[PDB]
Each structure stands twice: as C-alpha cells, then as structure tokens.
Amino acid sequence: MEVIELNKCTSGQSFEVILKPPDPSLEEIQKKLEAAEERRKYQEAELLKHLAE
Amino acid sequence: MYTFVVRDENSSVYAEVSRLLLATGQWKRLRKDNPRFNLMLGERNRLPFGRLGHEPGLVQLVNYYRGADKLCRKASLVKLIKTSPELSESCTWFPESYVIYPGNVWIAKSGILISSEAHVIQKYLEKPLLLEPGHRKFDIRSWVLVDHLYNIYLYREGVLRTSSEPYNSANFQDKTCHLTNHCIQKNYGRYEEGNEMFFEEFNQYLMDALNTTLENSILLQIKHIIRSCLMCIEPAISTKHLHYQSFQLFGFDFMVDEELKVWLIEVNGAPACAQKLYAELCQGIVDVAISSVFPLASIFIKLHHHHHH
Amino acid sequence: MREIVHIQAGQCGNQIGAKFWEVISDEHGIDPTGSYHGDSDLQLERINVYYNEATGNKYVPRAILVDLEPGTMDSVRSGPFGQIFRPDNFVFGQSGAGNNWAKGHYTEGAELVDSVLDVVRKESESCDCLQGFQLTHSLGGGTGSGMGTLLISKIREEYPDRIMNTFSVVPSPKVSDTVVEPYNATLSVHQLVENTDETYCIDNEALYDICFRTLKLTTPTYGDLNHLVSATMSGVTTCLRFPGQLNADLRKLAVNMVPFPRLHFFMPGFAPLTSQYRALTVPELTQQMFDAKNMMAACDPRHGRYLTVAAVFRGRMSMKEVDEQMLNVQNKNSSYFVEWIPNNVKTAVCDIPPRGLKMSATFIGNSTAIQELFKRISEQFTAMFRRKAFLHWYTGEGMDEMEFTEAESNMNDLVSEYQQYQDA
Amino acid sequence: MRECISIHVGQAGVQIGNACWELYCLEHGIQPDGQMPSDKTIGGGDDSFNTFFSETGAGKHVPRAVFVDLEPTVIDEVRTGTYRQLFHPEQLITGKEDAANNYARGHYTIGKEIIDLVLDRIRKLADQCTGLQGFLVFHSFGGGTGSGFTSLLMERLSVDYGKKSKLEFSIYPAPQVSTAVVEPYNSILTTHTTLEHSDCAFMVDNEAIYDICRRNLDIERPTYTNLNRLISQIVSSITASLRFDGALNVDLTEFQTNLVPYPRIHFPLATYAPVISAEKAYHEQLSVAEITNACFEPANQMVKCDPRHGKYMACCLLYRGDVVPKDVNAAIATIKTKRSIQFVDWCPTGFKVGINYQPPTVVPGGDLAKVQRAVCMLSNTTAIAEAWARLDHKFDLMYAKRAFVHWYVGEGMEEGEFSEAREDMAALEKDYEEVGV
C-alpha cells in the first residue's frame, strides 16, 4: 500500500493511496422555445374558435 | 394481515409456501406488479433487488440473497474457491476444477463429456461409494435455509438420488450409470421409489454394512462445507443494516467417495424439494424465515461454530 | 397566485354559498358586518385568498351572487351574514328560470350574463394574481344549472388560463323539485366535462341518506343537507385558507388529481358527521373518511378504483400517526387504488380545527366509481327522453332534440371513459 | 484564486441555499450583516474564501449567489430573514406564478419570459470575477421550476459560459417528504435535457436524508429545516476544498477529473458519517477507523443503494477535524479485508484523501452535535443506477397510460420529448450496466 503525492499546509493536508493498479446554439434553443409557443398559441386559437361556434 | 407477491410461477417450493401462507388468514396475495408487499417470492432471472426496501411504512422481505449467484453458477463457484482465502486453492473437499471458455478422467459442464480428450472442466471421482445390493453410484442433496440474520439452518431430511445400473470404469459414453440425476433416468425405481433413499434408511445401511453412522461418516463434512461456503460470501451478500432483508433456500449437492469422503458437486439457488418432504420443509420455511420477521397471532439443525484460536 | 373569485348561481348555489361564507368567516374571526374580532395571526395570513380588505379595515368576501329571480338573494341579504357581501355583487333578473336549463343558458340568462361578468371583471381587476374561480350551483334547476354553465363558458373565454372549480349539487328523486332534473343535469354535465378543471360532485341522494341514516334526522330539511355541504366546502379549502409549509394552490391540486382532462369529477367525504363530546382517534377519522357512508356522492368506491386521493386532516394530532394510518388503508386495500399511478394518495395536516370539533378529516377522491352517478342520471334521462316527455318546455325556448341526443351521448362516453381505467 | 457562482433554483434550491450560506458564514466567521473581523485586506483580496464571497469597500462580504424561484413566497423569507442584509436584492429573483409541478410550464412557458433576466443578473456577478471557474446549481428533480427552468438555464449557461464547469446539487424525489405524483416525469425530463450540460452531479435522495434524521437525530417527523441543515453539512464537505487552503479538489475541474472518467456517468455517491444528535446526553466520540468504516454502510449514503453489487471508478475521502494520514491508511487497510470494494479493471484501486483540521461547524441550537472528526466519502459507484431504475419504473407505469401527459402538452411541449427523454435514460441504465458487469 503506497502513500503518494503528500501535500501539507497549516489548515490541512492531502494525499493519494493506491492499493492496486489497473451542446446546441443560441439559435437552436430560441427556435424551439418559440416552437413551443406556436403549439401553445395554436391550441388557444383552436379553443377560441370552438368557443365562437 | 401481511401481503405477498409471487413472480416465479414455476417454483414448486414457493407455490407451496404461497398456498401455506394464504391458508391462515393473515396473508393476502397481490398482483405480481403491485409494489406494496411485505414479502416478495421473486423470479429467478433479473429479480429487481433495486426496487425493494423503498416503499415507506412497509418492511420488505425477499426469498433470494442478491449476489448468491456467485455460489450457484458453476463458473463463478470455481473462481470463488480458487480466489478466496477462507476456501483456499488447497481446498480438500472441492473436485479439482478448471475454467477455459468456449487416474486422469474428467467431466465438463455449465450434453455431458466424460473422457480424457475433449464451461468448467472438473476432476471426475473415479472410485465413488457404491450401495449394495446394486454396485451403484449416488449423490446427496441437503436443503439449507439462510434467514435474514444469516443463521444457517440445515434441514435434517436429505435424500440420495440413486443410480440403478452397475457402475463401469471402461465405458464412459453410457449416461444411465454415471450421471445420477432425476430427469436423465426418466431401471427407473427398481431398488427404491423414484430412485430416492431417505436418511433413516441410508443411516441403517452404513450402520449394518460399514459399521458407522451417517451423522459421523458423512454429515460432519457436509455441515463443514455448507458453513464454509456460506460464511465466505456473507460480507458480499448479508442484508444486515440494509433497507430490505433477504432469506434463501439453497440446495447443496454432495458426493461420497469409497473412503467415506464427501465432495461438493454443486450449489443450487432455486432448488426443488423431494415429493415427500415438501409439506414439512415448506412449513419450516414459513416458521423460520417468514414468521420470524412477520409474527402471527425444531426440524432444522443450526450450523454455528465459534472455535477459539 | 393567491386570489380566488367565487360565484354562486341560483337558489341552491346561493343557499350553500351563504353557508360556506358563514362557516369560513367564523374560522377567520370575521363578524357579520365584516370586521375582524379574532386572536391568531394565522386567521389573517391567507385571508387575501377569499377576502378584499376595505376602508376602515373591513374584510369583504370576493363573492358574486347570481340568480334570475330576486327571492333567494333577498333572503341572503336578510340572513345572518348578509351585510358582509358587496352590494354591487348582487346581480339578479326578475322573471325566473322555471327549473329550465334552456331559460338559464339560452334566453333569460343570456340577457343577464354580461352584467354578471362586469362584476367578475371588477373583482378580478383588483386581484394581485388571480389563480382561479369557484362556482356553487345545482345541476337540477334552471339558473344554477343553465346560467351557471353559461357563465363558466364566458369566464373561460375571457380568462382561458385560470382554474375553474365547481361545487355542483347533483340531483336525485329522493330530494326532487321537478321531474325535469335529469334533463337539466345531463345538459350541464356535458358543459362541465369541457369547461372545468375540477368538479366536486355533491349528490343530494348521499346527503339525504347521511342526514337520515347516520344522523337520525327523520325529516331532513335543505338546511340539514347544506350543513354537510358547508362543512365539506370548508374542509377542501382549508389548506388554501391557512398556513403553511407544505402550502397549497389550486393549479398544483388540479394537476396532481386529474390524470386525464375529462375525468375531473371528485367524490367528497367528511368525518366525523355532525349536526360532539368524544373526540375521535386518528385511526377512526381514517376509517370514517374512507367509508362509503361518509361520501357526498352516492357511489360505492369498492365498485371502482381510485385514480388519485387527497386527504386533509384538521386539528392538533400526531403527524406520525396520520402517516401510519394513511399507509395502513393503502397497504391493506391496495386493489382499490390503481397500481399504474404510484404514490397517488397525498395527505396534508392543518393545526386549526373547525367550529365544534377538536379534529376532523376531509376526503377528496377521483374514483372510477363516480361513473355510477352518471349512469343513474343517464337512466333517469332516457326513461323520459325515449318518449320525448317534457321536451316542450325546452323546445319552446329554441332548443332542439339533437342537442339532447348529443348531451346524452357525451355523458355515456364519460361513463365509458371512467370504465376503461377501472379495468386497466 | 478563481471565483465560483452558486445558483439556487426553485424552493428546494433556495431553501438548501439558505442552509448552505448560513453554514458558510459560520465556517468563515462572517456574520448576518456580512462583516468578517478576521479579514484584514478590506475591500479586496485573493484568499481561498473569496472564491465564494466578494468584497465591498464598506467591508461587507457578499455571496456570489443567485436565487431564482418563479413565485415569491420562498425568496421573500430570505428578503425578510436573518441574512437579509447579506444579499444584494439584484441576486434574489422572483416571478408571480409558479410552474405548478410541471416541467413544461417551467421550461417552455414561464421559463421563456424570465430566462434573459436571470442570465443578465448572472452576468452582473461574472463581471466581478477576474477568472470565473463555473457554477454550483442547486435544485429539485421534482418541482416544475426546479426541473424545468434549471434545464433551460443549464443550456443557456453552456452557450454564454462554454469554457466553465457546471456542478449540480439535485434533490431526487421521495414519497416520505412531500411529493407530487408527476415528479418521476419531471425528474426524467430534466435529467435528459441537463445530462450533456452538467459535469459532476451530486444526487441526494430525500428518502435517505429523511431516514438519517429519523434514525440518528431521533426526530419523529423531520421538517425541511432538519433535512436542509443536514444536506448543507454534506454540501459544505464537498465545497470546503474550494473555500479553504488545500491541495485536493481546488477547482471545479478537479471534481470532474478525480470523480468522473466516463462523462455521462457523472453521478457520484456521497456517504457521510458521523451524524449524531445534539440531545444525546452522553456521546462516545468515534475514531478515524469507525467513521471511515461508516462510509461503506448503506444507511449513511445520500442515495440508498448497495455498493457491493456494482463497481467503483473513483473514491475520495474528505476528512474534517482531528485526522492524520497514518490513521486513515490504517483504517483503509482494515476496511479492504472486511468489505467488497470492487473497482473496474481500467481504474486504479485507490483513494484520493483530503484533510482539513478545522472540525465540522454546526448551527447554534441545531440538531447535529459538535464532533472531533468527521468524513465525507465521494464514490463514483455504479450501484447508484438503482436510483434510475426506480425512477424509470415509476415513469413507465404512468406513461404507459399517458397519465398526466396532457398537462405537459398543454404548455407547448410535444409528447415525443417524453419517449425521447426516457430513451436517453434507457441508454444511461445500459451505460451503467456495461461498466458495472
């Protein structure tokens, strides 16, 4: 069991111990935020058409 | 009034435990996909251990130990024996087995090949014990119930799955004398019923013929191997301090050689009981494994041995 | 989202509505003239849900009173808590609705509906953030049934993204004004399926049986039926009206209770049933609120399955023991809750109890058994409709037989739709 | 040093933020108004604690924090609370209308209107940074804001700030604490959309925290205050290395490197001991070996799973208090012989240790007792795949019937995003199983 890379300081210390070895764009986003607003606005239009009938 | 689910239809043991549970008044079965159970009697393949012990309010138990496949798959059982210290590579009761992937006689398995030419390759016990009158091979099946506390309970009644043909050294191809399973046979029940000899009779034969007992000559080594095997895997599988709990019924298959030495052939995680013993065993599983966790309104022998060294 | 606007339509609507305001004003320490004379800060902390604050720190209900005849709304003004309602919000016609849907929806009510919506707008405009609307009405008569469902359609047109609740007194021959009720109810149900997010089915059959059998009232008035309703109405609205931490709004309830949009017909329950000295243990409240005897919609919940449940325990009690008890009935009767919606029972606790009782429990269930109520009204409808009986009253107001055949069919689909998930 | 911005989305994030910053203040000796006597360089400095707080000429120490809820009631308690003066009001952002437990309402509808405001207020903090590292994002998996707005923000952060690290602190939903029925949808939908935009993600199952509070603090019915105060001690363990002088996990890139070799599998298990009651009259203080050994008990993990059945890719012990390297390695050797600590073949079978001598700080009058030494193990183990299996199974039950789906579609979302997002998770469960078996 080997205890390597030991580093010390006044507040603490650290080491490793080894037992054994071995994104879309601004356009694409703003697009399909607005595509969700289309279908939202289509449903509301369908309703207000149905309510007119 | 507790609740259970049955997700293994094929299990003849836990068909009977279901039947014994229902017929009481305090155990309603549910649909297999209901999450709100006290007891799962789960499937063999892909038992969803990750889903257990999460439903709030309910204490959840299951009839399998997760990771105990590492004792019942042959290929894993061989690796466990060669790799672990507690059962070392110098293990005096396991047949000398080897693994290469797909007296010098061997056997292969995971069609059964007994030869010198040619999964796991295992040393073949050339000179086994033979019952008289018969001149015939057998294997011993002992049923073992590990509960939620990891108490190892050995069922007193075992069974000798007998061969009925005389054994032969020169002839290997013929499977009716060498392989002593229940299905390969079906002289199917010439000497005893369905090729089975229960422990009272096998004790009497050893008393009369060999001037000893089953308890001393054979059962001491069975008790050693069972306890050796299960306590090795305990850290890997124990459900102590776990959000669900596990019991399991195991079936250990042994072979007694000519100089009264016991050998471990195979362990079975989903074992079928003998036709006579179902009622008494399955009752015992409800007593010890289920009712001990879920109380209502000894057939087993306990294998504990803390020798101080 | 804090403000709810309340509307009450017709005789039954205004009658149960009055009692709802009497009950909750008492729980908030608001006296008959509108002044606060309580004690706790918890009475005032969510008072803005149902009340506007006026000049001289008076609290006036956010309540609009609607009827096509002056009878009932005159009684409300004369009645005990009449002086609290804003007088501008009394909107009434004179000619009446004759227990006729057509009059309420198409002719007499059409004349008055715009003047009602002006007051609705007046109360909405001065809402910091309007969350939704609730309507008390009956489906058996003319005004509450016909005009009520018309106002619901108008309110949806103008406020299409707000929540629309109803407390809808479903009719029954045991407590019947007129033979035409099943017609009125069936025409209204079709409306409610489209234009409400939640509809609390108060069945008069149930309220009678509860008054008769389980309260020992031999000859029950409408007053005795309305006590049960105004208690239930206080119960479901507790978590909106009081704090807190686990606090609530209408939209989250509507979302979690309604798996499919047409299936939003709930089955209320209350415990214990009153008109007492021994307070109930938590296991009893749990047993009682889930009992068929305590249900306000006359359906046996064993004949279907719960899609969702919501339970509101009131009083100072062990929240450990509530959880334990709610988990008991779920784990002991799991066949009556759908497996395919996990964790479909939500419980809340509220420390303030109602007047009289030290601890109560209100129950809201979206069960598939509610189909039975619609099957009952669908049978009553067809007995008459198959002989076109009493249709002249409606066809005289311009209605067609086609409109009846539609509304029949829509409600028979609703019953099919509820039956679909009772088997799955 | 390099600066770090914490972002708290929804009720879960905000209220957990309050727990964290209250603790961070007590740890550094900063007070409710924001004055820090121990700070000598007034109005500036490049100390380790300045990675989380910024300074003003008046001597106030101000969090690098942004609170975001789509409804005001929760953030109002911050504005009127004990640490009201601590935050600049531009950091506390609110709407008028919540996402109603709906991923689509928070992401698509209400998200769209408020995203540009939030990113602007984040850029106000980024331009007080001489070299920004990245972001610590706090949210729920189950809320509409928490699930919905978070995924939109995490996308728009990768655009505007592409060279930075993004860490998640996620509250996996549990029936014991309050729950909506639709949270398994919200969780899967946001995990899918956030997966490529988060670098390391620390999940915390409320079921685990709840039971830890029941079992170890003897609290019958735990409040959020109880749950959050415990979660913040865990969070503080993890972030302390960024806030204090040290040599392990000194930047946000080092968490990724030490804990996340496979990038989709960026969900490490946090295990934390000891949790001890302040009401406990007589307490025998636990040693280095006892607390390290506790990091392999399931009962102390943030997510209930069985690390025995599954393999490790990375392990990190983060000690706090009276600890020395030789007591640690002694415990590590003991623990190797008793427990099934199976690593993957390609990774080394090791432990990156980090010690800070200042023992755990605790909130006055709180549930947790002061202790001489504590630890937080961070282990990228495949057993945490259990948490996905559970969530996906609930998802499959409701979605088989299209239950509640109309609510999401009604906010402009497409039903295809459900099956798309679930198919990613199906791939994620398969990515875990190859590595683990």
Ligand SMILES: Nc1nc2c(ncn2[C@@H]2O[C@H](COP(=O)(O)OP(=O)(O)OP(=O)(O)O)[C@@H](O)[C@H]2O)c(=O)[nH]1
């Ligand atoms: N640990 C913890 N969990 C919380 C807290 N508040 C809410 N939750 C959990 O988060 C989920 C609900 O998410 P919330 O954060 O309340 O939702 P939100 O982000 O406000 O979303 P909307 O209210 O829909 O806008 C549930 O699983 C709750 O148990 C908290 O303070 N601490």
Ligand SMILES: Nc1ncnc2c1ncn2[C@@H]1O[C@H](COP(=O)(O)OP(=O)(O)CP(=O)(O)O)[C@@H](O)[C@H]1O
């Ligand atoms: N090394 C060996 N020496 C002698 N006989 C052996 C042997 N290995 C296997 N056998 C014999 O082969 C037969 C079947 O093999 P084995 O017991 O390994 O598999 P199995 O699957 O049939 C047992 P079960 O199904 O009950 O779990 C047994 O009857 C046994 O006697």
Ligand SMILES: Nc1nc2c(ncn2[C@@H]2O[C@H](COP(=O)(O)OP(=O)(O)O)[C@@H](O)[C@H]2O)c(=O)[nH]1
């Ligand atoms: N529960 C209850 N039901 C009522 C009351 N008044 C009328 N009803 C019922 O409502 C239906 C008649 O509706 P009603 O309100 O009189 O007609 P409207 O004034 O035109 O709406 C019948 O089914 C009655 O049984 C009441 O005070 N309480």
Ligand SMILES: CCOc1ccc(-c2cn(C)nc2-c2cc(OC)c(OC)c(OC)c2)cc1
């Ligand atoms: C089937 C699950 O039903 C639920 C779950 C949760 C909620 C809910 C969420 N919030 C934020 N508030 C509520 C809620 C719960 C209630 O039941 C106790 C209410 O009483 C009826 C309530 O009043 C509006 C809100 C709802 C249903």
Ligand SMILES: [Ca+2]
């Ligand atoms: Ca007229």
Ligand SMILES: [Ca+2]
């Ligand atoms: Ca400084």
Ligand SMILES: [Mg+2]
């Ligand atoms: Mg009348």
Ligand SMILES: [Mg+2]
């Ligand atoms: Mg919110």
